[PDB]
């Protein structure tokens, strides 16, 4: 069972320029000290990307934002996230997000990472939650409201248990994680990279190379996708359910892919130092 939470404010979105970033290894061959021209799906240099916040403030007027809207897929997705703690967990992919067609689910819940391909019925506002206890001084976690009906599952993968922090700090962001999602043939392909930063606002300008992470044989039809977040809940947020909660501090950026031609420059070990577009 799940509920709708309604104490949100209102504001239109924003746009931010992406600099020379978003390049990945396009095949499996190894080269060194070459200039190679490639044709593939890439993200254009100096292109609009869309900005999404999750920040709560009090004292001056009223400003509570918690955004996770349904967005189209088109040909592929480039995803970037900036956080001080762990606030983004995972994603739901599908074509109708109802009980008449299949869907894909990737979730982290502080003990195991779960990858499923199954028939579901997601409800309007999926979210995960935590609790802060004063007697313990411990950040214990108990909340999971993402679906209400799952059946006929085909693939299932549950991973090795691990530990993770859920504390939640204040200040400047100190992590950056980038993902690339592509769906081709009957295969789902995921690339990833991580880097440290010390910014306060907006996307860094630089260069990085992405490496392959996961290839899954699934065979679903994908047209839309949605994001899952985590929210806090403690003694300082009174009221009742659907009206008592607070947000953390996180942001993410999304962009799309197009057919382009690039001129990549390999190094003398096999690292892409820079690149140029036309």
């Amino acid at each position, epitope marked *: 069972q799940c509920v709708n939470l309604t104490t949100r404010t209102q504001l239109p979105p924003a746009y931010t320029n992406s600099f020379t970033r978003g390049v990945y290894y396009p095949d499996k061959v190894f080269r060194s000290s070459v200039l190679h021209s490639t044709q593939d799906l890439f993200l254009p240099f100096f292109s609009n990307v869309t900005w999404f916040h999750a920040i709560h403030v009090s004292g001056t007027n009223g400003t509570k934002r918690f955004d996770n809207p349904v967005l189209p897929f088109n040909d592929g997705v480039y995803f970037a996230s900036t956080e001080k703690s762990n606030i983004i967990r995972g994603w739901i992919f599908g074509t109708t997000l109802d009980s008449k067609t299949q869907s894909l689910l990737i979730v982290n819940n502080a003990t195991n990472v779960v990858i499923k391909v199954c028939e579901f019925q997601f409800c309007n506002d999926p979210f995960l939650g935590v609790y802060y206890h004063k007697n313990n001084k411990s950040w214990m976690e108990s909340e999971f409201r993402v679906y209400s009906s799952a059946n006929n599952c085909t693939f299932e993968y549950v*991973s090795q248990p*691990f*530990l993770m922090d859920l504390e939640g700090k204040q200040g400047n962001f100190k992590n950056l*994680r980038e993902f690339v999602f592509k769906n081709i043939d009957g295969y789902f392909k995921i690339y*990833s990279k991580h880097t440290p930063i010390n910014l306060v606002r907006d996307l860094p300008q630089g260069f990085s190379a992405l490496e392959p992470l*996961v290839d899954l044989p699934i065979g679903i039809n994908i047209t839309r996708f949605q994001t899952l977040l985590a929210l806090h809940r403690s003694y300082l947020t009174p009221g009742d359910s659907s009206s008592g909660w607070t947000a953390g501090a996180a942001a993410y950026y999304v962009g799309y892919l197009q057919p382009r031609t690039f001129l990549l420059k390999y190094n003398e070990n096999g690292t892409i130092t820079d690149a140029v577009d036309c």
Partner: T-cell receptor
Amino acid sequence: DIQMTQSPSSVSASVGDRVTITCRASQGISSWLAWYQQKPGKAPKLLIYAASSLQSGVPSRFSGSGSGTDFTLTISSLQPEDFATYYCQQANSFPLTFGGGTKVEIK
Amino acid sequence: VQLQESGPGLVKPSETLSLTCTVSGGSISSSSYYWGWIRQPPGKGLEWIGSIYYSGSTYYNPSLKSRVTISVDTSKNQFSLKLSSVTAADTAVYYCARCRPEYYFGSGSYLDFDY
């Protein structure tokens, strides 16, 4: 409260042969385990993680299978540099526990 | 990446055992990983004594839990393990460790040791 027993001890082998070690659990761990090798006078180095995999550039003459309450390790052939003690460890609960170890020597 | 444990030599009965682990090649702060200590007595046997995380959240082995503490000095890349009281059977060889990181998301270490 997880207890293990390692049944072989002080196995003797020649240069080309096949040797096998079994590490038994007591609880119902599910396909999570680790194997370790200790050359004399050094610190242990990891060889196999999870049920069946390999990290880094360990030679591919090392491979083991898995189950829910039994486990094993076998090597295809020996070289004069394979002479040490091997260990098995769990990766499930908070009280981490280690095995008694088994010794492999070349004859 | 690279470690070099350090500490004293001969000790006295029922005293505090000092120790220090100077991490080299890695920022002890610019990480989200765990660190730990491991013991091996002469002869046969291995035991895990404690694991720590920077900025609090300490854990301890259920056996021999009364007299063990672990601290981290975030100013440098150093952490230490303290035993208030020792016995005649506490002599061994001690090792630092690093917990292997997570693969899909980052920000997490498994319950296994490498490096």
